[PDB]
Structure 1
Amino acid sequence: MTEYKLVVVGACGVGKSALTIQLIQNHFVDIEDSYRKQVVIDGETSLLDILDTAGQEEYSAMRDQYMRTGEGFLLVFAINNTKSFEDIHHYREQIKRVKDSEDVPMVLVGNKSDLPSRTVDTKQAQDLARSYGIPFIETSAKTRQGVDDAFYTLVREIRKHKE
C-alpha cells in the first residue's frame, strides 16, 4: 500500500486542523495536529499521514522530520486573513530550503470560502499559484467545499512528481 506523507502549512487560525478533520473525520465544529487514514484516490489505496503545522509549535524536531520527508504540502491561507496570504511566500521558501529542491509538490489553498468577509481576492491567489506553478483550490472546512479536491489534487501532484 502506497503511503503519502502530507504536511499542511499556514498561519495559525487559517483552518488547517479543521480542513484535515473534515477530510479524515468528516465533521466540523466551530485539537489533534497529526492524522492517519487510508483512503482510495482514483482507485488507488493510499495511506495519508498528515501533519498540520504553523511552524511555531513546541515539537520542532518532529516538524523538521515531517518537513524533510513530506512528499507534498498544502499552503493554506484564509480568504479573510490578508496576513496569512502574505505569509505563504515564507512557508514556500522554508519548504524549498529544507527539501533542497525547486520541484516540491504543493497546492495553494484559500480556506474559509463560505465567509462573507473577504480581504484576499480569488485573482490574487490565482496569480500567486500561477507564479509558483501549482494548483489553487478554494475551500471551506465548514461546508466541505473543495476539501477532498485539495488533498486529492496534492496526491496527484505527488504522483506526477514521482513519474
Structure 2
Amino acid sequence: MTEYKLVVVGACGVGKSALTIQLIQNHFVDEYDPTIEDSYRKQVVIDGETSLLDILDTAGQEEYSAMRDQYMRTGEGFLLVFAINNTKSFEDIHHYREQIKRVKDSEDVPMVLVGNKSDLPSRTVDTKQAQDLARSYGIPFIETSAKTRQGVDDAFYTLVREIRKHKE
C-alpha cells in the first residue's frame, strides 16, 4: 500500500497540533506544548483506497533551519494552516509556500490551504480572500475547526488526494 509523508505548517498558535491530534487521537488539545515537533501515524481509507499517513506536526523557531529544509525535502504534501482571526498568519502563508518552493525546487508541490478556528464568532480574514488566495496558487481551500472537529478529516483527506494526483 501507498505511504505518504504529510507536513502540517503554519504560524505559531494557529492550530497545527490541535488539528493533528484531532485527526489521530479524536480529542481537542487546549494546552499542547508549543515546542513538541513530532510525527504521528494513521492508516486511512480515502475514496476507497487505503494509505498509510506519516504526519509531521512542525514546531520550530523563526529562523533558517537546515533540518526544516530536510523535512521539506522528505514531505510529499503540506497543509498550509492559518487562523481566521490572525491576519499575520494568513499573510505569512505566502512565505511558507515560498520556502517549500525553494527547497523542493517546484511550484507543483501538493498543498492545501486550511483556515482554522472557523467556530470563532469573529474573523479578520474573509473567506473570499482565502478562496482567492488558494485559486491563485491552484490549490484547494478548506475551513476547519479543530475545536469542534468540523472539516478536520476532509482537510487531511484533501491533501492526500492532492498527493495522489501529483504521483500519477
Report deviation, 1:63. Answer: 2.7
Q: State the match for 2:26 in structure 1.
A: 26
Cα drift, residue 90 of structure 1? 0.2
In structure 1, what is the Cα distance between the partners aligned to 2:145 and 2:64?
Answer: 28
Secondary structure of 1:95's partner? helix
With the length of structure 2 as denominator, give the TM-score of the two structures. Answer: 0.90
Cα root mean square deviation, aligned? 1.8
Deviation string, structure 1 residues 2-38 (Cα, Å, up to 9, x no partner)? 11100111000000000000011111132x6321121
TM-score (structure 1 length as normaliser): 0.93
Structure 1: how far apart are the matches of 2:5 and 2:150? 23
Secondary structure at the aligned position of 1:142 is classed as coil
Deviations 1:63-82 (A, max 9, x none): 32221011100100000101
Moved over 3 A (4+): 57-62
Q: Is the 8 A contact 1:137 1:146 kept in 2?
A: yes
Q: Secondary structure at the match of 1:87?
A: helix
> Which structure 2 residue ranges, 5 or more long, are not aligned?
31-36
- 1:146-157 to structure 2, matched below 5 A, reads 146-157=151-162
Give secondary structure in 1 for the equivalent of 2:125: coil
1:57 & 1:28 partners in 2: Cα distance? 26
Query: Are the equivalent residues in 2 in contact too, given 1:72–1:104 (CA < 8 A)?
Result: yes
Contact 1:4–1:71 at 8 Å: present in 2 too? yes
For residues 108 and 5 of structure 1, the distance between their equivalents in structure 2, rounded to whole angstroms, comes to 17
Q: Is the 8 A contact 1:17 1:33 kept in 2?
A: no
Partner-residue secondary structure (3-state), 1:7: strand
Distance 1:4 1:57, change over 3 A: farther
Q: What is the identity percentage for the equivalent residue pairs of Structure 1 and Structure 2? A: 100
The equivalent position to 1:41 in structure 2, one of 31, 43, 46, is 46
Find the aligned partners of 1:18 and 1:66 in 2 and give their Cα distance.
20
1:12-161 matches, cutoff 5 A: 12-30=12-30, 33-53=38-58, 55-56=60-61, 60-161=65-166
For structure 1, list consecutive stretches of 5 or more residues without a partner in the other structure.
none
